Structures are given as structure tokens and as C-alpha cells.
Amino acid sequence: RPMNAFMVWAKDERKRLAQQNPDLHNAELSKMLGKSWKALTLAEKRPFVEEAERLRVQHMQDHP
Amino acid sequence: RPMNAFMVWAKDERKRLAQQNPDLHNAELSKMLGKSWKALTLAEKRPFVEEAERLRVQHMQDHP
Ligand SMILES: [Zn+2]
Ligand SMILES: [Zn+2]
Ligand SMILES: [Zn+2]
Ligand SMILES: [Zn+2]
Ligand SMILES: [Zn+2]
Ligand SMILES: [Zn+2]
Numbered sequence: 001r002p003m004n005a006f007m008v009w010a011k012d013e014r015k016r017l018a019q020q021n022p023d024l025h026n027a028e029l030s031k032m033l034g035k036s037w038k039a040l041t042l043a044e045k046r047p048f049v050e051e052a053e054r055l056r057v058q059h060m061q062d063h064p
Numbered sequence: 065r066p067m068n069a070f071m072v073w074a075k076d077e078r079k080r081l082a083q084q085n086p087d088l089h090n091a092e093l094s095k096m097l098g099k100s101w102k103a104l105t106l107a108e109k110r111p112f113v114e115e116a117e118r119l120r121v122q123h124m125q126d127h128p
Contacts, residue, residue, distance in 0.1 A: 021085040028092045 002055035006037050009048035066119035070101050073112035 003011070010033050017029060037045070058064075067075070074097050081093060101109070122128075 017087060021088055023081060023096070024085055024088055025092075025096070028089075032087070032089070 002059045003052060005045060005049040005052040006033075008051045008055070009037065009045065066123045067116060069109060069113040069116040070097075072115045072119070073101065073109065 013033060013036070014029060017024065017032070018026075042049075077097060077100070078093060081088065081096070082090075106113075
């Protein structure tokens, strides 16, 4: 049940937005994140994509 | 074309939210405002309601 590329990338983007806008609702936070991720190119998402692949390998190996 | 009670009340509530959350989109800003206003009771909206009535009078008198 590891995080996918988006979750991996969002984890940091979320804190930066939430630890700055106490009034910014979570639902909207998720919506902004959803769209910013979409606007990104593969070249910009690549590292988050590789990290999700790394995490998936460890899970499938049962976390040695 | 004077502001109604909501606009009158929002004018201040908007600046306080926008001059604090550069990342908070306008569409969402309007949505939050729309709902907070709704949650308010007449007793809390009264002064903004009176101001809108004052403004309407001046307009109907053609702004003397
Ligand atoms: Zn909201
Ligand atoms: Zn790869
Ligand atoms: Zn696992
Ligand atoms: Zn938005
Ligand atoms: Zn009155
Ligand atoms: Zn007028």
C-alpha cells in the first residue's frame, strides 16, 4: 500500500501550503494539488515517479 | 448599483483572507465567503444589512 508518484510529490507540497494557509480548506488543498500535478510534465515528475517505483519494490519484497 | 449586505460585509473579509493567502484562489475565496455569510445569523448580519440599506437610499436619491 505504498504511496504513488503523486502522493510522494504531494507530501511536501501539501505541508508547504497547509503550514502557511490555516484558512485554506483541505478539500481545496487536494484540488489545487490535483491540478498542479496534472500540469507537470513527465520530466518534472520523474524523480517522484522513481521514488514511488522504489517504494513499490520494497513492499513487494515484504520490507526486508 | 450599490453593494448588497453580503458585498458590504465581504469587502473586509476578502482582504483579510487574500492579504494572507497568496495561493488561495479567488474562486475558492468567493466560495468560502459565500458559505460563511450563509452560516451567519441576522443579528450578526444586521449592521451590514443596515449599511446596504443606507447605500441604496443614497443611490435612489441620485447621490446628492
Ligand atoms: Zn472550501
Ligand atoms: Zn523507472
Ligand atoms: Zn508495504
Ligand atoms: Zn482552486
Ligand atoms: Zn433597517
Ligand atoms: Zn448609485
